[model samples]
Target: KTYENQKIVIDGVALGTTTFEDDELLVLKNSTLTLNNFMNIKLPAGISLTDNSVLNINTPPDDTPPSDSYDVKRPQYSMVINGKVSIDNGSQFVFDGSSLVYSLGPYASEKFLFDINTGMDGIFISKDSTMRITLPKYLDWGFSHATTKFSGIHIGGTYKAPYNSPLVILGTLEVLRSDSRTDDGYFDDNLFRIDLGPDKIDENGVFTMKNDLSGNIHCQGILSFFADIFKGTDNVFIRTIGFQAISPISPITVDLAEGPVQGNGYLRYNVIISQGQGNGLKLLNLQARLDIGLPIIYIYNSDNYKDLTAKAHDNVIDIIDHSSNKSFSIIGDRKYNITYWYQQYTEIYPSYQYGGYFKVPLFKKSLQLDFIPIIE
Candidate 1:
């Protein structure tokens, strides 16, 4: 066990059967490492477990192992946090591992970065134990407004497991922000959420996002099924994908906001198209044929001063399909024009005024008319 320019505080420790062979360069500046009960460490000259860092694993009921054997390979057995690791904790880390390597930077190093501020007390993985974390491709795991929580069982990386296997991940896991704050202190609109559970993928069963993600995703409960699957490029603002029954798969391009796409159940799509200018598609039960594209209204007036008239109208909006009562309209057909404006004190010399056309109903906002003098 070697260290240089150090500060190692292994509080309330227990090196069970101690073994840290030929180790060198275990420099940790401003460090505090704590692991109670059955604590075992094997360093391969790579450990800089940060400032505000905490590695806690307090499991001891006789160290529980015997039946099929694998309490970290019982010999009073195995523990390895091999090289370049940084675990930043604010509190509560109920950890249990069988050869763990929680690296957030350095291992194939290059533009390294790290930050796991589990502030609101979170991080628990202990059911058939396996932990290997090396995440850094933009991971903001909790602690914005406050109160954070992460209950894992399967979240792999580094090309998906198997170096010795027990859940290993290296890079690329874009933005997983879980901020929380409540109890009357604000910020808990719903406790800053993200639950892609039950095969929709979470607990690290396989939830991957390569790149492009901004923020603002408030999806409540069952948001997917069968390994959910959300692949890249999301300028998110999905206010809510509430109460389950979702069908997600469109290469992840969501900018949705008014909730309930089909909450009560069954919302299917394969070919649905609506484009531009505030598009529309609302269904609670439908039977097609709804065409709307309204815009064509122009009226002008400077009358009685020298006849400069203009009027063109064809604005119809009729939509009534109470289950095929059939009535859909967005009409346009009206054109007229007239021009003349010049009177240097009645010395009069400007003529042209005989415009006509009318069929109005799209004049819903602005139109000024006053030139109805043409009967020849």
Candidate 2:
């Protein structure tokens, strides 16, 4: 495959080789191979290694290394190496060690890249196929507070396949950081992005990789919340006193009855008292009181409202004729409900009289009323 217009010249050499093949073994024993500017290379169908053969790779500093390597094989054969292999600066190597029985070596500063293309699964490196990798440790990007685990990585390109095609990666992978913060402020959009395309995701921080045919991909980030108000009276006051509304409960009621007119000469009343405000009751007891006038018949039978009014007046004598003493106070929390039917109604008009009844509903409120009876 030729990449025509997509070409660049390096060191006065036009490198555009995409594929390299050799039917026969191109053996290099104890030889120094220098590949100056070759775009990409694919070793022959079979690359078998035996004995002590050293392969060294070198490339320029500013060049973008090849992105992938393809190795076509079956049943898989192991490419064993009982020697050393060194990959210097710019060169990358991939091994088709599908059939290898085993390999062993203490490779130096080289990254052994692998691509699992064939539908076949498993890469078994025998007790002999041994290698060491020393990747460059640098601050490439910002630190991550989350964890990551790669199932299986594709070096060159992706594989098109049918489900359960033996090309499945099985494992639990996780990456964690020691000195990282997981706060919500660390993210740009308060969200994480992954496996998105260029058209899906743009430089303006917008993208959607959901439309891709490259299977399903997902990105996730940790989410959390915070409550700022966390302290003494201030917090309590805001939650309690700050949110007040009128009570929906109904109030007490009272009904007055007529004499022997038609219905029963009875009075019925209902009352409900809601405690509003204040602290000490010794002052006035925070009381509410009602004065009901005596019935016309009571004028002859008993002392009426006037008699009560006079009593209240005398109580105010402390100020020398002051009306303040005319007031009566009910003690703290002392509630009273009084009901009495007048018998005089039936006696005064026996022929035209009807049954009489008196009813008092529950007091709706506490009225602190007090009286100091004094002989004035």
Candidate 3:
């Protein structure tokens, strides 16, 4: 099936299939596909979502049906990818929730279960794959306050959450990643952006990464905490953002893409480190750095006052030179700025805690080349 330059809307039991497999093709080219239904669809084997194609999946709004109503509860739905989806990377997959429980788990093992009832991977992003998730730059989650639940989303790959509107998540999802390589290897990655546009009108995305009974994250590939909140209008904020790993060891690197002139988007974050389970990870490597930057790269501890900016060495909590790729460690709680070090180091450079061997300093890889940034 091929759809080109068209608008396709699915509602009321349409395209109602349980699963799709082996040798089927569905292509959408320069088109917009809106699926307003409560169904889980696994893309056909030979799928081509190309040439700026878009697929918007979410439940219906207004509950117009007389028979059933989400007024009682919002149903959860998902779109799984079995084959090729997105040809030129120009494709857009929007999940604006009217149902509120809409989540997309499109990746492979090293995965999580999106539908525990179905007992499978939740919002899977194949290993080594980086899922570019974008928020609706033109919509709101609710009138005043609204809550959405991403029950389970296995972020096995590089998951980038770069936004342009108000998005607020409530918890943290400390996930798992590849570590079968070395005895002391394996960490997850997280990619955050402060595209906090116009801050006029309590706008900001407080994201949640956790589970219930439950599930969540941890990664490598530099989980960047970039604060590009360019605004003075209303008051956009990235409230309650944190990286409290017990936050185990994925040998993950957290980068704070520092913008010297990032507008006021004050957020008090925390980070609680750990060596993970029993026989625990010994040489956990963590790397760190930002676009030679500060202010938003924070860690709060009452007595331990987190330090990732060489605060003890220079009373400084700022980064700028990519060449100064130093090493640091994390032993307590913290967020982005967990530096990469090897052998012996008494610092986590940009993060205020203790741990060692993050290996790759000058962090921020997933979205790291804003091109080798020029932040002064």
Candidate 4:
């Protein structure tokens, strides 16, 4: 049921107007009320909130906000807690139309200690439900002390955070890349723009390929993140996925239909990264320090194996490894070509060839491996 015109007063400041935006009913100072799903709440002159209780505005799985019959400019239909609001564990509060005051104290002078400054208000995205402060509006959790109970937050608008407040997220933070170019004739938005702080994210920052972001188009998207290591002025950009355990299968030996086969086979390992659209465009030009014990690209030039060289595509960087340590990293995206040569011997002819060719016999197998990107 829709409860309309329930104006609340935090101490003396009466909200539910154009000057101040409120998303909760302000469950009195000492009254305890538990609202779940569809329920009705009748009130008296003094229905203060339960100290630190969680009453909110649930928007369901639809799109727009609700319209009430009362004269209150923005009537938030849910109960507002007196303190720390949890956005998870079956707690979801979306602020689509109205503004919210997430203060820890019941008085009007109390400050929202841990706050968030967004276009609108808070965007609570859960596994099955979502409550968002819709659009590119202004949300000043300026003094908010909130912890997003959900795990994923894909921001579609501007997020303004202060120096003292921390936007604590329970999961990943995704950022989008605008496909527009700048005056420098470059794709702007490839750098890590916002200084996400004080926030804890698993993906840290992730963007999609084409328009969606990361890894191979066939495997899990976005598996690594960006870092500024191995310093250099023009090299403040390095996307890395530290420990990628390339574990395919267990088959020491196998059989194949014997025939006249004259072809080359190579192993393709897509190093998925966890990063978002960087600060406009300057080209994703950071030296990567990947920690995978596998040769990305190599060739047997003449007798001894040497680093392979090839033409790079618009967004490709084939960093080949030739040393005994089969580990390497590139300075670009893996959404390009990495085709090379790989040869093995059937049997080492003891007295047939010279002391150059390491005739080590082996079976030909082409495998496409997928792994979790571990940040070292």
Candidate 5:
């Protein structure tokens, strides 16, 4: 049935239904036709176009006098197809916007374009297609534009076959030929300005290389050693070195103290080295100077000075008083110094039992002493 400037209805619906078979449709010039839909259009299932079809949606110009020209815009058009709808590349689908909007129902899968009056914002290509949208700039997820005059295109990510579900860009976007003359239009050269991950590059041009994860270190550890001397005395020095082990099992401890008192005291100690192949040894450059807080207590049996009685029986000596308030620091490299401090007191009697106690040599043999450090 031919419809012209009249209301059409079908199956209690406002629009009428006209089914065409494979052998029943034709087009001739001068045949006037019109379709007025107050609302929407829906297509039936299994409807097939035999060869090719060109669907034009428009509102004809109003009838007027010879000199009077009517520039009436076309009415908007929308169609729904329950079955598969295919169109050739050369075929066209026009959007009638002056009179009505164009809409393809949720189920229509037409290989066509919607030539609208304005930019792409008015168009809604549902998430149902495997089609792809190309754009000139970066696109965030769920991005929507305001008009059809878009400098970009939206290709749906959900079609089957070549326009398959997984959308991929085959290659870098080619620059417009007109942009070659302007440096302002080139890409930014700074490394940090670019975004990372999957969306930055085209899917087709992506590649897996062995050097993907190779980069310089972003973090590191540092070690330092120092020493200080307070008086104009003999030379004092320190040395330091560091080592690593395969399976180290010993604990190292270090401590800090105002004066020397080895056990059960307020002094804090840290183990600088434990057990392993060269585990507890630190290599350092030694520096020496003379200073106060002297008369060093030289530890004779340091490695085995743990027992109080054994240390007391040995030549353990204390040079400085435990309450002396002296604060000094020394920093520089030094090799593995001995590990113990000894305190030895000698009895020097002015009048001895046998003639001044034989006047034992004065100054107690000028003792020697060692100090531990704080470890980090």
Candidate 6:
């Protein structure tokens, strides 16, 4: 199946018994490949998808197949894009399947380029193999809104033993929206669980990761927000939430415009060393700022709003409504400005112990303001 300068559209077509040869190349130029129902394509020579190409996968209908028969499994297929591919609005590739492996990488080279600018239904990669997808630019989660369930496995990279491949994104990955639901309208949990290196080799080693996005990350998911990086053999994990900033080596900053509605919608940063080794995490020149929104109670024909102004420390605000002869204290509208220099230490000599080993002066700041009701 060699397509050099042609357009291929796989719509409503069933290629269940088709065998794509290894020397075959499903090339496409200004083409669109759409898949629906139980359609499968096994490409070995990889695909040359570029020049306004599109790969769109739609969800299979309820009455498809194996809905009633558990013993009879549906057909599964995998397509390896060994060549450079560019997907945009002009071209679309869409499909749906219970088991599907869509591999993209250079077969002969160490790096392969993949660019996706259009929308896709859902993509899942179950095979554990080493692969790398060089980002031409930042890629977003297909869905944008909160209601729609953006459920699928978009493996930009993957690493495992034997093959022991390291999934590396040559550029920075960004997520604009922060919410994804399951097929049943449930929030799909665990967005990313990425594994880092066992040892760093040149470019083609066991695991080598690099970032060229200049550390500019934008993640807005509410629950299970950021991706988790698990370093092999170290039992170390780094969990981040609403994390958008440069590398930790530089000045890291996260600004949350609006807080979470139901709970403490704030940024969370953590680094865990599970084995209690002598190695630990460190932070330098760190600063954080938070602005809270408080409810406003209106009192008609009253001009005593100034009485509510008090020191905004320890989450306390004193307010006296003299019109009703009642005095009350509101414990909201709190601000935070913290500056500290500390080092967390882990001791494994006598017993496994971990504690912060520092005696630096900590600075705390706060602010309070009078509430003014909105006038209509």
Among these predicted structures, which one has the highest TM-score? 3
lDDT of 5 at 359: 21
Worst 10 residues of 2 by lDDT: 237-246
> Distance from true position, residue 136, model 5, in Å?
24
| Tens digit of per-residue lDDT, candidate 5, span 239-347 | 1011111122122211111111111212211112111111222222221112212112222122333222111111222122223322112222432222343344344
lDDT for every model?
0.25, 0.19, 0.28, 0.23, 0.20, 0.27
Superposed by TM-score, candidate 3 places the C-alpha of residue 115 at a distance from the truth, in angstroms, of: 8.7
lDDT of 3: 0.28
Please write out the lDDT profile of model 6 over residues 1-376, one tens digit for every residue. 4444454544443655333333565555655555454333344234444556545444334343222132124343333333222232233343333232112111101111122211111121112211222111112222221212222222322333322323232222333222333344322222221112111122333433331212223333321111222222131122222221111112222233322112223222222211111112322211223322222111212233332223223333333334554543333323322222212222222211111111111111112233232233
TM-score (C-alpha, index-matched) for candidate 5: 0.18
How does residue 288 of candidate 2 score in lDDT? 22
Q: Residue 323, candidate 6: how far off, in angstroms?
A: 59
Clashes of 1: 7
Worst 10 residues of 3 by lDDT: 136-145
Number of clashes recorded per candidate: 7, 37, 77, 42, 69, 18
For all predicted structures, in order, the TM-scores are 0.19, 0.21, 0.35, 0.23, 0.18, 0.34
Better of 2 and 5 by lDDT: 5
lDDT of 1 by residue, 80-196 (tens): 433333222221123433232222111101121121211111122222222232221112222111221221222211222212112111211222212222333222222111222
Q: In candidate 3, which residue ranges exceed 4 Å CA deviation?
A: 14-25, 44-47, 62-76, 87-89, 101-152, 155-240, 243-311, 315-376
Q: What lDDT is reached at residue 302 by model 5?
A: 24
- Writing each residue's lDDT as its tens digit, candidate 3 over 1-376 gives 6788999886645656423222465677888877675445555343445566776655344334322233234333444543233233356455443233211211111122221111111122222222233211101111111212112232221112332222121122222221221222211111121111111112243223211111112222222222211122122111112232322223322332111111122111223232221111111111123432222222222222222232212111222222334434322122333232212223343322211111112221111111122224
282-314, model 2: which lDDT tens digit per residue? 111212233221111111112231222211232
Which candidate number maximizes lDDT?
A: 3
Ranking by TM-score: 3, 6, 4, 2, 1, 5
Of the candidates numbered 5 and 6, which has the greater lDDT value? 6
